[PDB]
Structures are given as C-alpha cells and as structure tokens.
Amino acid sequence: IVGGQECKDGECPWQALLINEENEGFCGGTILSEFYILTAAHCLYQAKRFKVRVGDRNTEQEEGGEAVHEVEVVIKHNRFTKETYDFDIAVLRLKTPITFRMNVAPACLPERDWAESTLMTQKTGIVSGFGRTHEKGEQSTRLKMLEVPYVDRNSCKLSSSFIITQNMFCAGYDTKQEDACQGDSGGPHVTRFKDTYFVTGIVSWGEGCARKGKYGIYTKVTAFLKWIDRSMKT
Amino acid sequence: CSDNGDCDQFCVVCSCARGYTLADNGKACIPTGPYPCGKQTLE
Ligand SMILES: O=C(Nc1ccc(Cl)cn1)[C@H]1CN(CC(F)F)C[C@@H]1C(=O)Nc1ccc(-n2ccccc2=O)cc1F
Ligand SMILES: [Ca+2]
Ligand code: NA
Structure with missing residues (x-):
C-alpha cells in the first residue's frame, strides 16, 4: 500500500497473507469463511508451496491471534492467463478451519x-x-x-x-x-x-x-x- | 427496490448475508454469532 x-x-479482519517457504509474504487474500480464502490466480505462480497466515498486523512481531493454515485444495479459474490477466481469481480450501476472533473474521x-x-x-x-x-x-x-x-x-x-x-x-x-x-x-x-x-x-x-x-x-x-x-x- | 427499499442488506423484499437473520421489522439484519461477516472486530 x-x-x-x-x-x-x-x-x-478479513485480511489473509500468503507466505512462501521463506515465511515471507508475497500476496494477500480475503477470508470468505472458516475454510475458504479468496485470492488472485496470478499469485499461484509465485511460490509452488505456500501457506496462509491469518490475524497478523505486524510481520516483525509474533502477536496474539496470529495463526498459520495449510492449503488443502487450490481452485484457480481455468480461464486465467498471464497474456491478458483476465479471470484473475482463485479460491483456497484450508486443511483446518479458521477460528474467528479479534482480527480474524470473514x-x-x-x-x-x-x-x-x-x-x-x-x-x-x-x-x-x-x-x-x-x-x-x-x-x-x-x-x-x-x-x-x-x-x-x-x-x-x-x-x-x-x-x-x-x-x-x-x-x-x-x-x-x-x-x-x-x-x-x-x-x-x-x-x-x-x-x-x-x-x-x-x-x-x-x-x-x-x-x-x-x-x-x-x-x-x-x-x-x-x-x-x-x-x-x- | 432502491432507498434500498429501507433494507439493511439485500433486496420491497429484504434479505441478509450468511451469519445474519432478518429482524422483526423485516428491514434490519441481526448477527447470529460474535464474528458475523463484514464487521470490524472489537475486544
Ligand atoms: O503490482 C503492481 N501494481 C499494482 C498497483 C495497483 C494494484 Cl490494484 C495492483 N498492482 C506492479 C508493480 N510491480 C513493480 C514493483 F512495485 F514491485 C510490478 C507490478 C506490475 O507491473 N503488474 C502488472 C502490470 C500489468 C499487467 N498486465 C495487465 C494486462 C495484461 C497483461 C499484463 O501483464 C500485469 C501485472 F501484474
Ligand atoms: Ca505479527
Ligand atoms: Na495514479
């Protein structure tokens, strides 16, 4: 920003952060429910393996409410292409459900x-x-x-x-x-x-x-x- | 419908997003839990 x-x-509170194997943020997401994150299909090209962090406000301090979730299913729009950047959407199903709390809500x-x-x-x-x-x-x-x-x-x-x-x-x-x-x-x-x-x-x-x-x-x-x-x- | 037909959420016939129920007025939306969708959180 x-x-x-x-x-x-x-x-x-609906902010999600996609983190790579370096534990570094490379994309955002939107919490849609206890199991689903909305993100950009183009973000899926950046890191073969990634996880989702919820509840974080400061990436330098581990503060109460932060939690890490593994992704079970990646659903990328089949029409997405880097040629046009059209259909830039993906939904992630998490392996475990998010517990809504302060800084964590859809x-x-x-x-x-x-x-x-x-x-x-x-x-x-x-x-x-x-x-x-x-x-x-x-x-x-x-x-x-x-x-x-x-x-x-x-x-x-x-x-x-x-x-x-x-x-x-x-x-x-x-x-x-x-x-x-x-x-x-x-x-x-x-x-x-x-x-x-x-x-x-x-x-x-x-x-x-x-x-x-x-x-x-x-x-x-x-x-x-x-x-x-x-x-x-x- | 639209002064949004006086509805708090969807639409004169009102409706609300999942995690809310339409109030007795039939114009307002009531959360069903402590973390309904689209509301900023308070301690
Ligand atoms: O991310 C960006 N900007 C930005 C600003 C506002 C919002 Cl809301 C989102 N993103 C920029 C800045 N970044 C550089 C630095 F800030 F990191 C490179 C990136 C870029 O060139 N994207 C970029 C540009 C063009 C296309 N594009 C569009 C249509 C068809 C083909 C195509 O390639 C795709 C891109 F991802
Ligand atoms: Ca933090
Ligand atoms: Na500008």
Whole structure:
C-alpha cells in the first residue's frame, strides 16, 4: 500500500497473507469463511508451496491471534492467463478451519444483481495489505489500508496500456500518490453498505504503483459470485 | 427496490448475508454469532 494508513486492531479482519517457504509474504487474500480464502490466480505462480497466515498486523512481531493454515485444495479459474490477466481469481480450501476472533473474521459475499446496482455504484472501497509502500521500495511490515474511489471504466480504458475486461474494475487516483502495490496482490477490496463490508474486488495489477495517469486494477468479484459459490461447494 | 427499499442488506423484499437473520421489522439484519461477516472486530 502506497499512502494510506496502518490498519488499527480489528479494522481489517478479513485480511489473509500468503507466505512462501521463506515465511515471507508475497500476496494477500480475503477470508470468505472458516475454510475458504479468496485470492488472485496470478499469485499461484509465485511460490509452488505456500501457506496462509491469518490475524497478523505486524510481520516483525509474533502477536496474539496470529495463526498459520495449510492449503488443502487450490481452485484457480481455468480461464486465467498471464497474456491478458483476465479471470484473475482463485479460491483456497484450508486443511483446518479458521477460528474467528479479534482480527480474524470473514468479509461478506453479496448477491450479484444487488451488488452490481448497489455496491459497485458506491463512491469508494477499501484496499488493504502488506505490499510495497512505494513502487521501488520494500513490502510493509505493517498491515496498511487505503480508501480508493471507484474509477469510471472508460476513463480507465483510456489511461491503460492493457485491455480492461468486464471481469475487472478500476479504483484509485489519477495523480494523488496513493494506490495498492505489488505484494497487496490477491488481497481484499471491500465496499461498505450501511454498516457492513462486502468483498467487491481482488487486488490484481497496475502499471507500476500510484503512477500519474494510471489506476489500480481489481478483479470484479460480482462477475464470479456463481463461480465462487460453486468452488466453496465442490 | 432502491432507498434500498429501507433494507439493511439485500433486496420491497429484504434479505441478509450468511451469519445474519432478518429482524422483526423485516428491514434490519441481526448477527447470529460474535464474528458475523463484514464487521470490524472489537475486544
Ligand atoms: O503490482 C503492481 N501494481 C499494482 C498497483 C495497483 C494494484 Cl490494484 C495492483 N498492482 C506492479 C508493480 N510491480 C513493480 C514493483 F512495485 F514491485 C510490478 C507490478 C506490475 O507491473 N503488474 C502488472 C502490470 C500489468 C499487467 N498486465 C495487465 C494486462 C495484461 C497483461 C499484463 O501483464 C500485469 C501485472 F501484474
Ligand atoms: Ca505479527
Ligand atoms: Na495514479
């Protein structure tokens, strides 16, 4: 996260962190239930073997509530390709169930049609993660969050070197130096409706981070609500 | 439906995400446990 703030205790409880054999974070995830994590399909290419850490806010301090889970099943969208970065979604089934607690709770999955008309039409969402604090810099040891405005699809297509598909959406700022960055990849984008947070995006890609004239690109979760439902039931 | 048909969550006919039940008003959503989805946690 470039800009933004550190998550306070209990503020980003649906954040998950994918850790490699070095015990290093390389991607985020969203807790969907006691057994399921939502992530980006592109994250699966980074480490052959990985685990999931929940409840962490500081990667340098082992604090109460942190727990590690092994992944039992990886469900990657069969249409994902690095050529287009389209269909950038995967669901992970954990071997053991997560115990919900302080800093560990799921984001809500919305109903499709309602989400298209009611959530995707809100002004902003919140992106969070342990990713780079600058395009050229290091990953954050602290969990950060950032409020990002939804960006018009056509303004985003004009700004982009690459095709923006209907399975994507854009969020962020044109020149303000705030955005998600590499390492937040796979992590949550949530939208508040009244007093509840619904998962609306997956951190997917961007041309650098917080670049002037460039936006953050997210997988559009509404496009995959049936897919997610089937994956959580298989 | 939409002032969201006065609903707290989905939609005039309301509904809520898993881990909530629709209140007696038929417009509000009540958590069924201590860690319902989409709520920030408190000590
Ligand atoms: O992760 C990134 N930025 C970022 C910023 C905001 C959000 Cl929300 C998410 N990610 C950037 C920064 N990182 C460098 C440093 F910050 F680490 C390299 C990475 C990249 O070039 N991605 C990247 C760029 C383009 C494509 N892409 C898109 C469409 C078709 C083909 C294609 O390759 C795929 C990518 F992953
Ligand atoms: Ca920690
Ligand atoms: Na920008």
